[PDB]
């Protein structure tokens, strides 16, 4: 198990249970926001952490409910944070589902903050406008969970990774497909992008130039991940394939995380996911140095031993040793906690320089 700069439980089972991590880096602020579901999916909680590089440490402030990120009589789940670098606005997207839980009753929601997460606007229900008629051909959908993406296209578009359970045939159960919600006017209007392929679930997206490419990395029902690419900013994921090197454990997979960061030499991808093909154990990191080539995915390196599940990655700028710094949040010990991990490219992939 890799040398890391920090390893700290930031949420743990107590009065409540914590699952579904999301992580947001705020560059100008040397700060991180760690989100999770608080469950009896009830509510969403937040912890802010200040990153002090000379001490190689993030200090986490107190846990707080994001009071506004809720609908009456609904449970809130699947936090997807995004920072709009053009507007200084913080977005938190999420799913609202009736308390009493065939017919779609799932709601799409956003709250915003302009004081870096300290306070929040009241929720906007994006459901009808964002989805339209399709709403009726699904039994449910989700967003994320985890960080979303803002492109460096002209409009600085927002990309919110998602999936839908489609009612495609009357005899078959609903079938899941990944897709993205897109906005070009900074989250005032939303469009639903086209689906990727049958039997994909929780996904995340990253941008790479090498000419703009949205890469999407999706959970599968199969033994490997599904990776897909858009050249039109996430409207169509034209190519799609299984990635045998990125394994998926029994019943039906695990959520994992993908980010891009600057090439030490334009971008490389980092991906986290459990690495036992047999179970949700042994959080590994994988590097794609010639992205998005599926065959360029590396062997995993080991970040955490034992029982690990969902994760969320953030690029945090330059690490004290000069190489890309990464922060990571994942579910651990049979969901008894969510661990924050911070480490650098030099620490994890010493052989691909620093």
- Give the binding site for ligand FSI (CB under 6 A): 20, 77-78, 142, 201-202
Token couple for 171: 């005899």
Q: How far is CA 341 from the centre of its chain?
A: 15
Instruction: Name the active-site residue from 331, 337, 352, 353.
Output: 331
Long-range contact set of residues 38-43: C-beta below 8 Å, sequence gap at least 24: 38/65, 40/16, 41/75, 41/76, 41/77, 41/97, 42/16, 42/75, 42/76, 43/69, 43/70, 43/75, 43/76
* 310 counts as catalytic: yes
CA distance 41 to 122: 19
What minimum distance in Å lies between the beta carbon of 317 and ligand FSI? 30
Confirm whether residue 212 is marked as ligand binding: no
Confirm whether residue 165 is marked as ligand binding: yes
Strand 57-60 and strand 191-192: pairing? unpaired
- The residue (of 224 and 296) whose beta carbon lies closer to ligand FSI is 224
Confirm whether residue 19 is marked as ligand binding: yes
- The residue (of 19 and 346) whose beta carbon lies closer to ligand FSI is 19
Confirm whether residue 202 is marked as ligand binding: yes
What minimum distance in Å lies between the beta carbon of 328 and ligand FSI? 18
| 65 beta partners | 45
- The residue (of 202 and 312) whose beta carbon lies closer to ligand FSI is 202
What minimum distance in Å lies between the beta carbon of 175 and ligand FSI? 11
What minimum distance in Å lies between the beta carbon of 200 and ligand FSI? 10
Instruction: Name the active-site residue from 18, 51, 310, 330.
Output: 310
Report which secondary-structure segment, H or E, holds 271: strand 267-274
* 83 counts as catalytic: no
Token couple for 130: 């964002």
Gap sites in the chain (C to N > 2.5 Å), preceding residue numbers: 40, 101, 210, 265
CA distance 94 to 76: 7
- The residue (of 201 and 303) whose beta carbon lies closer to ligand FSI is 201
Annotated binding site: 19, 39, 163, 165, 202, 219, 280
Which of the residues are catalytic?
Answer: 310, 331
Annotated binding site for substrate: 19, 39, 163, 165, 202, 219, 280
């Amino acid at each position: 198990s890799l040398p890391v700069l920090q390893k700290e439980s930031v949420f743990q089972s107590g009065a409540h249970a914590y699952r579904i991590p999301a992580l947001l880096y705020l560059p100008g602020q040397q700060s991180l926001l760690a989100f999770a579901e608080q469950r009896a999916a009830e509510l969403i909680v937040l912890r802010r952490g200040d990153y002090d590089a000379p001490t190689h440490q993030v200090q986490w402030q107190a846990q707080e409910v994001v009071a506004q990120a809720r609908l009456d009589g609904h449970r809130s789940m699947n936090p997807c944070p995004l920072y709009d670098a053009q507007t200084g606005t913080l977005f938190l997207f999420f799913i609202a589902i009736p308390g009493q839980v065939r017919a779609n009753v799932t709601r799409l929601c956003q709250v915003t903050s302009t004081d870096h997460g300290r306070t929040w606007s009241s929720p906007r229900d994006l459901t009808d406008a964002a989805i339209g008629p399709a709403y009726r051909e699904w039994s449910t959908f989700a967003v994320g969970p985890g960080h979303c993406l803002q492109l460096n296209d002209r409009a600085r578009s927002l990309v919110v990774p998602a999936y839908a359970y489609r009612k495609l045939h009357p005899i078959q159960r609903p079938i899941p497909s990944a897709f993205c919600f897109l906005s070009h006017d900074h989250g005032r209007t939303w469009a639903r992008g086209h689906f990727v392929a049958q039997d994909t679930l929780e996904c995340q997206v990253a941008e790479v130039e090498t000419q703009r490419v949205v890469t999407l990395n999706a959970r599968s029902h199969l033994r490997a991940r599904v990776q897909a690419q858009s050249t039109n900013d996430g409207l169509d994921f034209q190519e799609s394939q299984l990635v045998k090197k990125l394994v998926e454990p029994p019943p039906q997979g695990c959520q994992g995380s993908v980010i891009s960061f600057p090439s030490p030499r334009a971008q490389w991808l980092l991906y986290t996911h459990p690495t036992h093909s047999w179970q949700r154990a042994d959080l590994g990191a994988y590097l794609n140095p010639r992205p998005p080539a599926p065959e360029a995915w590396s062997e995993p390196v080991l970040l955490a031993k034992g029982s690990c599940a969902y994760s969320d990655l953030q690029s945090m700028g330059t690490g004290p040793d000069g190489s890309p710094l990464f922060g990571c949040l994942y579910e651990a010990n049979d969901y008894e906690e969510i661990v924050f991990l911070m480490f650098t490219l030099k620490q994890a992939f010493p052989a691909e320089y620093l």
